[PDB]
Amino acid sequence: QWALEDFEIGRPLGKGKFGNVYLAREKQSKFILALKVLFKAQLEKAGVEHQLRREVEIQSHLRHPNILRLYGYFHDATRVYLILEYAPLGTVYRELQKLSKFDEQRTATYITELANALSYCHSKRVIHRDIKPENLLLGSAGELKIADFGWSVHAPSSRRTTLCGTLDYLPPEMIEGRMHDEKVDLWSLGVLCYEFLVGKPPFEANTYQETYKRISRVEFTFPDFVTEGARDLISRLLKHNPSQRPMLREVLEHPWITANSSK
Ligand SMILES: O=C(Nc1c[nH]nc1-c1nc2ccc(C[NH+]3CCOCC3)cc2[nH]1)c1ccc(F)cc1
């Protein structure tokens, strides 16, 4: 439907192995968006093309204030193009380096927005699995927007593994190579939540190998300034056993959420 000549490319928004995302304006609509440029070249070499058109599948038929829109795609010779909703306020990652830590009220809010976002997603048996600060964009309202549905997947499944990837946000089951459902995303939400308050993720290490242990044994500790309600909800989120992990609904209802969730 679309083609490159339909756009005016703006400034580079960032990187990634397969290319860059650029700001861009739709020529005859004046519409602002982001263009993720992916080289066919590298997608095949690094055998991921399967993933692409699945990221496209899922993130297309998806509609939620807290999920980055994907308007469509296209390609030419050299590369494939992803027409992404543009999120004015950068990444939560970046806001994190920026602020070093978030407060209870900012954290809570994100969790809420996050919860609901994920809520909608499970409802369609869609599991994200790769929720990390780098993947969280901010809308103008300052609101969370889950990007990147690359690893995203249906059903309760088992993945084609490959170890070479940051474990920091993976749940024990995933990492241990096991039976994993939509409970992963609640483990994620827990990590996310801890990182927001403390400034690093609770399982951080210097090596793939140590983290693996750390995650596998659920070894984490709270700095003093982490409040009780925080500790509670995080503790409740970070159970080795998928089954003991709250339902998203319970997370919304948690008293430390609702005390603090501005939005
Ligand atoms: O695709 C990406 N980002 C986006 C998708 N949609 N919208 C974006 C997006 N990212 C940014 C980053 C910065 C800004 C502008 N803002 C100005 C004020 O200071 C903070 C940055 C906009 C933007 N949109 C993306 C982001 C980060 C990566 F590492 C790889 C890809």
UniProtKB/Swiss-Prot annotation:
Domain annotation Protein kinase: ranges: 7-257
What post-translational modification does the entry describe?
Activated by phosphorylation at Thr-162; this brings about a change in the conformation of the activation segment. Phosphorylation at Thr-162 varies during the cell cycle and is highest during M phase. Autophosphorylated at Thr-162 upon TPX2 binding. Thr-162 can be phosphorylated by several kinases, including PAK and PKA. Protein phosphatase type 1 (PP1) binds AURKA and inhibits its activity by dephosphorylating Thr-162 during mitosis. Phosphorylation at Ser-216 decreases the kinase activity. Ubiquitinated by the E3 ubiquitin-protein ligase complex SCF(FBXL7) during mitosis, leading to its degradation by the proteasome. Ubiquitinated by CHFR, leading to its degradation by the proteasome. Ubiquitinated by the anaphase-promoting complex (APC), leading to its degradation by the proteasome. Ubiquitinated by the CUL3-KLHL18 ligase leading to its activation at the centrosome which is required for initiating mitotic entry. Ubiquitination mediated by CUL3-KLHL18 ligase does not lead to its degradation by the proteasome.
The subcellular location is:
Cytoplasm, Cytoskeleton, Microtubule organizing center, Centrosome; Cytoplasm, Cytoskeleton, Spindle pole; Cytoplasm, Cytoskeleton, Microtubule organizing center, Centrosome, Centriole; Cell projection, Neuron projection
Specify the effect of T161A: No direct effect on catalytic activity
Q: Where is this cross-link: Glycyl lysine isopeptide (Lys-Gly) (interchain with G-Cter in SUMO2)?
A: K132
Q: Which residues carry this modification: Phosphoserine?
A: S216
The effect of C164A is:
Enhances stability
Q: Which residues form the active site?
A: D130 (proton acceptor)
- Location of region: Activation segment: 154-167
Tissue expr: Highly expressed in testis and weakly in skeletal muscle, thymus and spleen. Also highly expressed in colon, ovarian, prostate, neuroblastoma, breast and cervical cancer cell lines.
Q: What is the effect of changing Q209A?
A: Reduces binding to MYCN
Q: Which reaction does it catalyse?
A: L-seryl-[protein] + ATP = O-phospho-L-seryl-[protein] + ADP + H(+); L-threonyl-[protein] + ATP = O-phospho-L-threonyl-[protein] + ADP + H(+)
Task: Describe the effect of K36R.
Answer: Loss of kinase activity
- Give the GO terms filed under biological process for this record: anterior/posterior axis specification; apoptotic process; cell division; centrosome localization; cilium disassembly; G2/M transition of mitotic cell cycle; liver regeneration; mitotic cell cycle
Q: Which residues bind ATP?
A: K17, K36, E85, Y86, A87, E134, N135, D148
**According to its UniProt entry, what is the function of this protein?**
Mitotic serine/threonine kinase that contributes to the regulation of cell cycle progression. Associates with the centrosome and the spindle microtubules during mitosis and plays a critical role in various mitotic events including the establishment of mitotic spindle, centrosome duplication, centrosome separation as well as maturation, chromosomal alignment, spindle assembly checkpoint, and cytokinesis. Required for normal spindle positioning during mitosis and for the localization of NUMA1 and DCTN1 to the cell cortex during metaphase. Required for initial activation of CDK1 at centrosomes.
Family, similarity comment: Belongs to the protein kinase superfamily. Ser/Thr protein kinase family. Aurora subfamily.
The protein, known as: Aurora kinase A
Q: Which residues of the full protein are shown?
A: 127 to 389 of 403
